Design a binder for this molecule. Structure first.
Ligand SMILES: Nc1ncnc2c1ncn2[C@@H]1O[C@H](CSCC[C@H](N)C(=O)O)[C@@H](O)[C@H]1O
Length: 259
C-alpha cells in the first residue's frame, strides 16, 4: 500500500463538509460565475473558458512544460477546454477533438472562442478503440475519479496504453496526458516504460483539487517519477485539516474569432 492509497482512504473517510473544505484548501480556482451563466443561457459568442480545464492546460503551456504545435489531437475532449485552448495558440494549425459523450458525460460546448474554426469535434467516439492517425501534439485528459483506487489505477493504465499507441503511430509527437492515479503500482510501471522510451515527467498543476491525485505527464519535462509521486502524496496527506479557502483568480478569456 502506498501513501497515495492512504490519501484515498482518508479522503473517503471524510464527511461531506470535510470533503468540501479539503478539496479546495490552498488551490487556485477560476471565477466562473459569468462563464457558467453564458453557457447556461446558450450564448455562443464568448471566449471565456468552457471548463476548468483551460486554465490547467494554459498553466502547463505558460510554464513551458508543454509544447502545443502543429496538428493537435484532443483525446477525451469533454466540453473542449483543452481544444479551445490549443486552437487559440498561433503555433497550432488544427485540432481534432474526440469524446464519448452519452449519459453522464460532457458533450463539446460550441463557442466562437478564438480559432474555433480550426477544431473538428467528434462526439460519440471511444478513443480507446480508435485507430491513431498523424499528429504533432497528442493531448489526453481522460481519467474518471472513483472512490476505488484500484479502478482509478486501471483507468489510468488504459490512458497510458492509449498514449503508447499514439506514440507508436507518431514517435516524434509531443504528448501531454492526465495521470489520474499516479501512485498505483501498474501505473508507476507503465509510466517508467513510457519515460524510458519517450522521455518526459510528471507535474502537479495548482488548479488541481486536493480531492484528486491527478498529475500531468508531458514529454517536454523530466524527473524521477517515483519521487514526483511521493512528494505529491505527502503534500496531499498534510493538507487534511487545513481550513484555508481557495485562491480565487480570474477565468481565462481567449477572445473570439476565426483563425
Ligand atoms: N473512452 C473514451 N473515449 C472518448 N472520450 C472519453 C472516454 N472516456 C472518457 N472520455 C471523456 O473524456 C473526458 C475527460 S474530461 C476532459 C476535460 C477537458 N480537457 C476540458 O478542458 O474541458 C470526459 O468528458 C469523458 O466523458
Amino acid at each position: 500500500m502506498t501513501l497515495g492509497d492512504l490519501w484515498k482512504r482518508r479522503l473517503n473517510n471524510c464527511t461531506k463538509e470535510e470533503f468540501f473544505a479539503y478539496r479546495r484548501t490552498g488551490i487556485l480556482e477560476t471565477e466562473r460565475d459569468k462563464a457558467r451563466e453564458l453557457l447556461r443561457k446558450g450564448e455562443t459568442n464568448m471566449g471565456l473558458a468552457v471548463s476548468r480545464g483551460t486554465a490547467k492546460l494554459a498553466w502547463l503551456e505558460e510554464r513551458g512544460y508543454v509544447n502545443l504545435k502543429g496538428e493537435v489531437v484532443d483525446l477525451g475532449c469533454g466540453r473542449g477546454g483543452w481544444s479551445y485552448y490549443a486552437a487559440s495558440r498561433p503555433a497550432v494549425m488544427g485540432v481534432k477533438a474526440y469524446t464519448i459523450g452519452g449519459k453522464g458525460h460532457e458533450a463539446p460546448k460550441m463557442v466562437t472562442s478564438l480559432g474555433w474554426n480550426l477544431i473538428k469535434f467528434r462526439a460519440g467516439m471511444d478513443v480507446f478503440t480508435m485507430q491513431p492517425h498523424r499528429a504533432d501534439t497528442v493531448m489526453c485528459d481522460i481519467g474518471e475519479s472513483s472512490p476505488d483506487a484500484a479502478i482509478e489505477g486501471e483507468r489510468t493504465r488504459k490512458v497510458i496504453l492509449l498514449m503508447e499507441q499514439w506514440k507508436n503511430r507518431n514517435p516524434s509527437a509531443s504528448c501531454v496526458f492526465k495521470v489520474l492515479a499516479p501512485y498505483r503500482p501498474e501505473v508507476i510501471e507503465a509510466l517508467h516504460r513510457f519515460q524510458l522510451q519517450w522521455g518526459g515527467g510528471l507535474v502537479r498543476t495548482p488548479f488541481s483539487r486536493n480531492s484528486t491525485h491527478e498529475m500531468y505527464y508531458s514529454t517536454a519535462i523530466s524527473g524521477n517519477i517515483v519521487n514526483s509521486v511521493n512528494v505529491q502524496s505527502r503534500k496531499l496527506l498534510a493538507r487534511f485539516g487545513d481550513q484555508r479557502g481557495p485562491i480565487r483568480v480570474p477565468e481565462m478569456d481567449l477572445g473570439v474569432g476565426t483563425r
